[PDB]
Amino acid sequence: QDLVPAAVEQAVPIQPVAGAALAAPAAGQINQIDPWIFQNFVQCPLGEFSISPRNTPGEILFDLALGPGLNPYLAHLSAMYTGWVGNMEVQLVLAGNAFTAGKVVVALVPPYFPKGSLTTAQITCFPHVMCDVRTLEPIQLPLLDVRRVLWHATQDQEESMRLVCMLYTPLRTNSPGDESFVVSGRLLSKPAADFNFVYLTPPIERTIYRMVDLPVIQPRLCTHARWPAPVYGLLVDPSLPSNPQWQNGRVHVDGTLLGTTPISGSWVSCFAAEAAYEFQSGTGEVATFTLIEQDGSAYVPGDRAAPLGYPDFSGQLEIEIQTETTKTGDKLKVTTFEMILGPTTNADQAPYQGRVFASVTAAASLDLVDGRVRAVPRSIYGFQDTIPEYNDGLLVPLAPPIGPFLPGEVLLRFRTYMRQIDTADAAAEAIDCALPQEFVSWFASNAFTVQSEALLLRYRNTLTGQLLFECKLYNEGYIALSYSGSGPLTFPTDGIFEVVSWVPRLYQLASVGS
Amino acid sequence: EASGQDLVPAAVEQAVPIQPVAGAALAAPAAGQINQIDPWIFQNFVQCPLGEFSISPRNTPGEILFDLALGPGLNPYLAHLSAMYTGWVGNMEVQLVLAGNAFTAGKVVVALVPPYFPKGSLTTAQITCFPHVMCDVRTLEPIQLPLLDVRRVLWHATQDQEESMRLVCMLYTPLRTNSPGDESFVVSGRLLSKPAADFNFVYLTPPIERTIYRMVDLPVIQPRLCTHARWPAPVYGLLVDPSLPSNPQWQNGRVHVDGTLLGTTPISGSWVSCFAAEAAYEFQSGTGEVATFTLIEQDGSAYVPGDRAAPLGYPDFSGQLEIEIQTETTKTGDKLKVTTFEMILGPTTNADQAPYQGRVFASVTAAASLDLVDGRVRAVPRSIYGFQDTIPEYNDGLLVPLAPPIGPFLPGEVLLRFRTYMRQIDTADAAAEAIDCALPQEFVSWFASNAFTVQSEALLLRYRNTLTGQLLFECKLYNEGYIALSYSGSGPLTFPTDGIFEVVSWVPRLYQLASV
Amino acid sequence: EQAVPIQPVAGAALAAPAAGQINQIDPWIFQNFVQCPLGEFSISPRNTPGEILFDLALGPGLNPYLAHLSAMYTGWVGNMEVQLVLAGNAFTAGKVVVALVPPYFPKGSLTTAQITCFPHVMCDVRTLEPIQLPLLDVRRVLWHATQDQEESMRLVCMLYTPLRTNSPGDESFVVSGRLLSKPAADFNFVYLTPPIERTIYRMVDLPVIQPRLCTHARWPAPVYGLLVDPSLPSNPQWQNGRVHVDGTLLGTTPISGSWVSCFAAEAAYEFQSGTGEVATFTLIEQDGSAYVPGDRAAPLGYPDFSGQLEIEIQTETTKTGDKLKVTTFEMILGPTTNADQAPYQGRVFASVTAAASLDLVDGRVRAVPRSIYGFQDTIPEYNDGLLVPLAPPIGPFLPGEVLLRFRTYMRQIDTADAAAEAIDCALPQEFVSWFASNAFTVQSEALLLRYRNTLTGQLLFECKLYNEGYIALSYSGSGPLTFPTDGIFEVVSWVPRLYQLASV
Ligand SMILES: [Ca+2]
Ligand SMILES: [Ca+2]
Ligand SMILES: [Ca+2]
């Protein structure tokens, strides 16, 4: 009587969701967009992901949220509106082989479903599409505005429908292996027929859904963020410790300054304090410094280990100060003082409590008048890359170690050389930073929104266009490279970084090496 | 229909000052699916999960008898169905049953409290400022009330709780009886509910068992087949005794109904009254061989003094405890042995012992210095001498964080005890030494591994006999983790250990239990 | 009214299906334009274009009657009508812009170019009639909650084109502007609830007590006078007598007046072979509690001045000539060190000038002040030479504003001159307790106050009470000026920080 076909094309059944019909009576305006934005799939700002045989079933490959942050045109247009309503459509492409086996599921997760941990059995209880990694053509899905409000505010994030993809079946290759074959995936989107904005406002450039960019300066023309010297090298080195705990040069991508890093590069490794001088018997002058901020304000013990720009390493410091004497026939001079920074004893060093001690040998009194001084670094002796004596021997608030790199990932280092006093070894002492200056700035000056876990960057030659490597910039302000060698590897410093897209935490980078 | 109607019958007085409220019709254009509830569910009144309450002549006006929040948690069908959705809307119908004796008198008020009204002290002056209904306790027919969805959103979320209309009942007039003989009656009221015409759910989601509503359940196991939570022995007795101290401060076997462990109670029953440590041995011409133990966690982790008086599973009583220890010796002929040590738990001794700092001392009498190598060991109990059921010293007389004493109880309520017997050394008395606990270890593991969500204040339990299927008594299980029942006798009372406990409903603290 | 590019907004028609009740308001309220709070400004020839003249948010708090009525309801909905009045003659020039800013626009600084991109109106200062505007309820919900502050439409007025005028030689010309409002025909309340007294639309008030019957917050003595003296330091850093208007205690101030300049501690007495007996105190809370160092310099009520004082404690002797006694100790607070006083860590030292052993027992004591020697108005030594967390100095003040001080006199030991002592405070202890127990809601930056005589009802002066808990007066003199201690302080209204007081 009836025939049931064995092969049916996949589709997602939906019930239509009302947009501006529900929002019109309570909104001030209903603003329509260009009719040709409805005709083209354009790559999402988060539009890159990867699949590897290192992955396991149940891992989330990506998750996207409905809103004007999925389309470059809509993200550009959102700067002159206060709200939005409507549905969208998403397209997915995978670059697979004929030798690869594997299945993924793309599901539609409603708002207010708890965001804990889904499993492979649960993911198929949502409206979904099952996709093979060998597909040649793109796959598309809808995104409806299931909501309890009349419309959404642009300037916040709120809660909306999500699009989550997880690895349903493990990725296998018939080849003996193991290789390092990676399947690339890209995402595109476009609004559906029932999308518009709410209220026409002036265009504000410093809005959310504004893409992050970087200053166009080569690394040679930059300033080191931990020692006052120009940047001289760019390298990766797996023989060095992997998770340092530097306190300077640390900034969040969204603009938060972590640790004791300042805004300007003239505050690095310097300090400002009120000085009092004394003489003991023959040891010379002893200077006690009560520390303040470099702009003249007062220092209060808080969530930082020291005033902004305080040195975060160990050794003996030779510094310069400006002094005035009460002697006859001699006005202001510049004096050199000796300082102890490393974890030691026989002194009471507590910059966390605003007390510092310095000294200089002298057979006379050479009395000086107390006042405000600014101390800058001149020379270093016995340098060690470890935190200083912030308190006497106690614990103070600190920025966390860098971490938590994926397997095979190493840290990119910007390298400069210090002025060092040595007797036997003539080698130049070297110090490293994660991000240079003018990168600490351009953050906290632009208040960006992260919208994802990492940023993909490409390093390129200026006048040739050759690609040197690609890297991941995490939201915590450090760069990772995929390198598996044993020795140091350096790179030319006349390149330019450029932003590609937002990528998730599990993204797999193309390997680098010699 | 009934015999002498010298009562109130129907409380058809409402004309409640409220407008009709729209339900699922406002949420249909904002949902991406079509959902509906089984039409037969809309056709009968079933008892709410919090559908039992009591009025006693010991309550005062202004006490809250029940308060119910609108949502899927008032109906067993709807609470089962809410595990596979994210969203609900609509109104409800509620039936209140309270038909006390004809010799009684009293009055209650049931009010409709809107969302966003602050919770806390609700006095008898304000409850009449709401849309309300006045009820006699002698009313024969059930009283029917509506619960409307007053809201400013289109629907609510099943997981996590939001602000909705409440239904609050407060005792307005004290309950008194007119009978000549010796007693005053108690009124037992019931609540039933069903959805209204426009109730619905929103979006189908995977069915997850560990949802917020669910229902608390207990393991199906007889008390005689369980293990004691304070001494490594089987449970032998189920008892109530009003001559023993009423508010003990035991540190082991304490667990919250939501799953939190309080005190020094371990997950496993093999950690009870045992400890793992690093042992260093020395010879003293007095006590003989002296062993110093620095205590660590039983799984091997480091011990850090924190918000607990001792490492998990440490003994919480007093006396002289004798234990067995595995030891290695360098004397030719013997390699491994089990040695018996003894140590004073309490009498507070000279100065000493500081379990809160991980220091323990023990000794064994001997003449020649036995060659013993320092190492890692685990000690388990063997015997007790001069047992006293009082907390020991942990900080050498200084205060330590402790679990609160068990309580409080309503007047006439006593604590139920699970009893076992310990191996004892005695010189002139041959009577067995007994030790009690509040819950067995199986219940502790069940609560720790299940992590339910509590609703009001306590659970009503009924104890049934497996052989004859006859209910023995009813008790209140408090959310803090103890059990109370009403008993007014003088001597101890014991119960058979062949029964099974069962959950009935959620009850508040002022629930009045029947005597036993 | 004027035409603006905006659509009509529905009120109760959208809230009625899901509301319980829709409640009506007195029809006489719809017939009166009442002054809005923070709805006045003045324009001077020296102002530059781009200054924000006002910005007010839609809600019940714009009208005193609706603010009163909101206490017996759960929600509200609807639009309002607004009137703007400007006072200038025919010989002026300049222009102003009033815009409609939507509920979720980011807060910040607007430029004169961006204000014209909203729905707006342009007005000349020569306008005769008041300018009428609508205030519409643009929202993503069905109604609002009375006890919660949500986002609503705002009305923002900026100076667009500067004022050009002539002025006489004695006074400078200004253009004054005021804003009034009333509900529109589509405004309603939601649900009849029992009235609440601790609502958010509650105005700040002060206790009706004369300052001569009050208590000093820094020294346990009655207040003997109030004054203003520009010669004294402008920005003191007192750690006592500091309270926020919303009710947050700052520094080390206690709630009770009996905790001022007193401390409780566990005492250990040991006889030194030199000067005499020495007592070491481990500080605790006055009511009895563990003291933990934190964001606070010293336990509540600890003295915040420098000098040498004497204390009296209850001591018990194990000898047989007595059992209980009260003796006077001696401790040093000023920045002279020599004993390593660390109140921040919770330990201090004291000594007595006595010979031989003076056996006592350690059973906890409370120390009260007796007299001060070498008093100095500087913070004591909390750490040996280190820094501690403490409250910022009092300020800032506008150009021409001075601090008003409540003065009291303390005992002394000085042997050279016997004129008087002097210790000042910002607010008395009664005001501190009032603000702590009331917990009001602050609106903008400051409150306008008035000092009047109780009987004749004459005005003495007017001042400004800042949110941080200090009073400022507009005084242009040189020497100190004292005031009678018989008046009563009264609250007038909320004022902005840049408010010009009348000179005293
Ligand atoms: Ca060297
Ligand atoms: Ca015995
Ligand atoms: Ca004097």
Coordinates of N, CA and C and ligand atoms in Angstrom, one line a residue, chain A residues 420 422 425 427 429, ligand 1:
Chain A
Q420 N 75.2 45.3 32.6 CA 75.6 44.4 33.6 C 77.1 44.6 34.0
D422 N 80.3 42.7 35.4 CA 80.9 41.4 35.6 C 82.4 41.5 35.6
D425 N 83.0 36.7 33.2 CA 82.3 36.4 31.9 C 81.9 37.7 31.2
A427 N 79.9 37.6 28.5 CA 78.7 37.4 27.7 C 77.6 38.4 28.2
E429 N 74.1 39.7 29.4 CA 73.0 39.2 30.1 C 71.7 39.6 29.3
Ligands
CA1 CA 77.6 37.4 33.0

